[PDB]
Amino acid sequence: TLEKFVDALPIPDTLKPVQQSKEKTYYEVTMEECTHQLHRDLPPTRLWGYNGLFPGPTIEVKRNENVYVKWMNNLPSTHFLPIDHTIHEPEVKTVVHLHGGVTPDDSDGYPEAWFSKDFEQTGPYFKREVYHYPNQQRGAILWYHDHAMALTRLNVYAGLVGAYIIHDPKEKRLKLPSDEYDVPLLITDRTINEDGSLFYPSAPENPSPSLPNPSIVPAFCGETILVNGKVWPYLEVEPRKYRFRVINASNTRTYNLSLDNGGDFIQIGSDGGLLPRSVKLNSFSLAPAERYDIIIDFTAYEGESIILANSAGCGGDVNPETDANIMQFRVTKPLAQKDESRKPKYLASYPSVQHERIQNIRTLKLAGTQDEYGRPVLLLNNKRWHDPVTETPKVGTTEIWSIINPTRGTHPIHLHLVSFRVLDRRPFDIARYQESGELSYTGPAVPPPPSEKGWKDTIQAHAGEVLRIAATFGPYSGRYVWHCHILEHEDYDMMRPMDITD
Ligand SMILES: CCn1/c(=N/N=c2/sc3cc(S(=O)(=O)O)ccc3n2CC)sc2cc(S(=O)(=O)O)ccc21
Ligand SMILES: [Cu+]
Ligand SMILES: [Cu+]
Ligand SMILES: [Cu+]
Structure with missing residues (x-):
């Protein structure tokens, strides 16, 4: 095992704009295969990185800054990590998702809006090359990474991750x-x-x-x-x-x-x-x-x-x-x-200061089935990614999502576009729910700790509990997604489309 604490901490450089004005900021980021030493006693490592850097360069913007980023694929045509062709067309597909970004749907990095090298081929939901980030949201720590259909766990592991800060x-x-x-x-x-x-x-x-x-x-x-x-x-x-x-x-x-x-x-x-x-x-x-x-x-x-x-x-x-x-x-x-x-x-200011009417209440369960190979296939509400959309909130409205977790492990549930509040968590009889589908709580509701009293976009849904969150879907309408952020799960259908209707 490598000796600990011998290399100084790298501080990613802040990306400089290709063009910037009072009305607009334009950035260009190119995905490239590169080599980097990850430790003093290791030979260089072959990685994939935004602008050839791992992590990618840090991007800093101001709230309401009119930003554009042209994410480009200039990677090899073949991957270097193990690809499973049975879970789902060029071999190498990529799409950049600005996690936490309040973004128009065609700039959110939809899994099926992927593109191969130089945009030669594009997924069915591809719409634009230059992404648009209006940044009309609270200052915060956002981060960007690849979100390509069925390759997310690999592309990210390859090194396609970067920090994005809104000031x-x-x-x-x-x-x-x-x-x-x-x-x-x-x-x-x-x-x-x-x-x-x-x-x-x-x-x-x-x-x-x-x-x-x-x-x-x-x-x-x-x-x-x-x-x-x-x-x-x-x-x-x-x-x-x-x-x-x-x-x-x-x-x-x-x-x-x-x-x-x-x-x-x-x-x-x-x-x-x-x-x-x-x-x-x-x-x-x-x-x-x-x-x-x-x-x-x-x-x-x-x-x-x-x-x-x-x-x-x-x-x-x-x-x-x-x-x-x-x-x-x-x-x-x-x-x-x-x-x-x-x-x-x-x-x-407190998030609870806001008084919104509850337009709807969705009950979702974390489950899954088993494929022809004996492998587990994790599904959100027993639906597969390709099935017809079911989570269809109306723009401008607020809903309460009750996430039931009968599995034996925690799931970091993430919803795109929106930021949400945590209401509470409550334990239930897993055996009962699994046998009868009936939900029986085995204790009172537990409100969130100081840590979760603000705004969250990725929330931990513990085993044997029901997690409730509240979110106002907007300001944009369109086709987005919500999913478990454990990439290995996400890639094998624990991801569903989310249509915010107008
Ligand atoms: C619980 C979700 N989960 C995983 N899912 N894959 C599996 S394996 C599995 C086996 C059976 S059975 O084969 O016979 O009926 C039924 C359902 C399964 N699904 C899960 C429901 S892998 C993982 C690692 C960690 S760790 O750091 O984050 O240790 C935490 C949580 C995790
Ligand atoms: Cu993410
Ligand atoms: Cu998961
Ligand atoms: Cu995502």
Whole structure:
């Protein structure tokens, strides 16, 4: 196993515009196969990256900035990871989805709006080359990645992930740490071969003779953890307050972070932006696609080496010497100036201030069947991706979604376009529900903790519970999607279309 904490943390450069004016900002990003060293003792690794970078460059915009990004495919015609042709036409398809973006439907990166190299071939839902991001939403941590039909888990694992930040000039008065002291942290677990090449399972453990090859796997757990493209890195920090945009860009793995010196995290934001009130945390869970906007005060730890630790297991308990480690902070950098940043308690207006009428209430269940090969096929409400759309909210209206989870594992449920509030969680008799379809609660409703009292777009739906959320579908109408963000699940039909009707 690679030696931990020997490479410094890379800080992705901020992408510079091809053209910019007061009325518009135009960017160009090209997907390319490239090589990068992920660790001091590894040979270079072959990856796929936006502008040839892993992670891709960080994009910074202001609220309401009129942005355009021309995402281009200039990758090889053949993939380098195991493709299962039985779960679903050029071999390499790509489409960029701005996760968390309030985007017009033809710029949202629909799974079937893919395109091959140079846009030679395009999916049935392709409409445009240059994506449009009006950015008329709250300041927040967004991130972009590939979303191609049936290839999402592979393209993302290949390295197609990047951070996107929306800055709301009105929040500047909070004086939160900024600039050099505002650092994004993209966490991705990977398994790397001796030759430095990426390893992605070609099939499940002990493959059945009647199983396809390659064969998609229901989940993926890497043996190594990276942050911003480097294995267990270290970051030199000044003894003061820092802001971190934590992003889980992993296929399956869920993290449960904490600091080994017992220090606290100060959560100031969730997927949807600033929380109404800051929350002191000793630890926090972060499933795939979830984002935590936090402040860490290093002021009193000058000289110390602090480890960002993980206690959540993935396909087993955490290994103290490996996946139990994320990165290491080193409070040894001299202060460049006085720490003028603040860690205010009053961050933003409450979401509950809004009083919307409940137009509809959808009850959805997390299930699945089994294919001809004996493999599990996860389905949202027992429907397949290709079946006729069923989740059809009306633009401008608010609905309550009740997600029933009779499975034995947690599912990070994500809805495109919108941001939503969490109402509560409640346990139920799984056996009963599975045998009679009847839902019987075995305890009271549990309201969300301070962490989920803001706006979320990716939410954890625990096993044996019913999760209720509320969302106002808009401002745009069109064809979008909602799905589990565990890529291995998403690619084998745990994804459904979502039509916001007008
Ligand atoms: C319902 C799930 N579906 C499977 N894949 N899903 C997975 S893989 C997975 C890994 C983690 S981890 O870090 O994030 O360990 C957490 C949650 C996970 N889930 C969702 C629970 S495997 C299966 C077997 C049966 S049984 O009836 O074959 O005989 C029935 C249904 C099945
Ligand atoms: Cu996403
Ligand atoms: Cu899932
Ligand atoms: Cu998505």
